[PDB]
Write a protein that binds this ligand. Structure first.
Ligand SMILES: C[C@]1(c2cccc(-c3cccc(Cl)c3)c2)N=C(N)CCO1
Length: 372
């Protein structure tokens, strides 16, 4: 219960947890990222940082005498590797020694008003920078304490919770459905079917996972491979035909606004993502409402209206089930059993007619392997 409501933020700028680094403890807000594997923190002033890790003030810091360079698609950072004592004040009652990439230079990485100063990469060593030998935070936490090798995330639209070492039953209703982790690098999973308002996309299921499908709390949108994205936009446009939006909206570049409280939710269809089950050719579905894929953009200047960004976008690196997808579900990262669990959360998306759901089982006797 002491870990409930330990997250802040929103899908657009990320969800963050309070952590402490060094001795005496230096408090920092850290992005919870299941899509990366480095524990990296601002370690020098920047126009967008409220505070930063001051290594000279930590008597427990150890320099590893090794640099790290991390380029992304839209931004990059450089830093120095070292180790220090780390704790999560509203997490497990433990202090561990962990690798820390002290960010000393960055370009288009830190975000103004995000309220976070670093990233907690929760994925596996395989995708760690500079390489797989840099132990990730969670692996250290498990090795040094008696914490079970599992964490869960309950992301909530409008904070949320990160529960480490167990499953909190008060954070979900109904059944918990498991999908296998296909490979331990990202949290890679397999999507076996996609429907938009009950209509199957009918593609070869390998297309849904071209070149991988991941569960990523560090990506805002639902990101889809080109072929799947184009089919999804066609289907959503067809259901929403009573209203015509610019291509800029569908490209995720421009806002669609309606007078406060009048958003026509009913014109937008539900999206069903069928995930591979734990038994051959059995699956379960997670249903995504427009309250998830239409991301609200808060702005006092536009506040006579409710404005949204289309939170589905094209990817050339496979499917990404981002924060907009995770919101309203209780997501169990069961590393011990190499599986990811989904259940409807206490903060699930619903209106008078429709509700986000986790349903199963579904059977498909006529099925190939959906992995690439
Ligand atoms: C490391 C990062 C990353 C880096 C910097 C910022 C974010 C970020 C920014 C806004 C919202 C969110 Cl959820 C994450 C993510 N994490 C990912 N999972 C994909 C992109 O690369």
């Amino acid at each position: 219960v002491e870990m409930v409501d330990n997250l802040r933020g929103k899908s657009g700028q990320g969800y963050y947890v309070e952590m402490t680094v060094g001795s005496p403890p230096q408090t920092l807000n850290i992005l919870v990222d299941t899509g990366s594997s480095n524990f990296a923190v601002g370690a020098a002033p920047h126009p967008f940082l409220h505070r930063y890790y001051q290594r000279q003030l930590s008597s427990t810091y150890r320099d590893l005498r090794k640099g790290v360079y991390v380029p992304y698609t839209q931004g990059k950072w450089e830093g120095e590797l070292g180790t220090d004592l780390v704790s999560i004040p509203h997490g497990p009652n433990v202090t561990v020694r962990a690798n820390i990439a002290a960010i000393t230079e960055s370009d288009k990485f830190f975000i103004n008003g995000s309220n976070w100063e670093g990233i907690l990469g929760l994925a596996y060593a395989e995708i760690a920078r500079p390489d797989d030998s840099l132990e990730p935070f969670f692996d250290s936490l498990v090795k040094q304490t008696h914490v079970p090798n599992l964490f869960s995330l309950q992301l909530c639209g409008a904070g949320g919770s990160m529960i480490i070492g167990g499953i909190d039953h008060s954070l979900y209703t109904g059944s918990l459905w498991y999908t296998p982790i296909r490979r331990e690098w990202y949290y890679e999973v397999i999507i076996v079917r996609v429907e938009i308002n009950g209509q199957d996309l009918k593609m070869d299921c390998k297309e849904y996972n071209y070149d991988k499908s991941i569960v990523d709390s560090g990506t805002t949108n639902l990101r889809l491979p080109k072929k799947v994205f184009e089919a999804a936009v066609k289907s959503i446009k067809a259901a929403s035909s009573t209203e015509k939006f610019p291509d800029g909206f569908w490209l995720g570049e421009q806002l669609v606004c309606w007078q406060a409280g009048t958003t026509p939710w009913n014109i937008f269809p539900v999206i069903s993502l069928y995930l591979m089950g734990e038994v051959t050719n059995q699956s379960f579905r997670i249903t995504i409402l427009p309250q998830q894929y239409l991301r609200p953009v808060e702005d006092v200047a536009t506040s006579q209206d409710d404005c949204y960004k289309f939170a589905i976008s094209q990817s050339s690196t496979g499917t990404v089930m981002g924060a907009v997808i995770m919101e309203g579900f209780y997501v169990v990262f069961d590393r011990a059993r190499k599986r990811i669990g989904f259940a409807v959360s206490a903060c699930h998306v619903h209106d008078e007619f429709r509700t986000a759901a986790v349903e199963g089982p579904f059977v498909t006797l006529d099925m190939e392997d959906c992995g690439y």
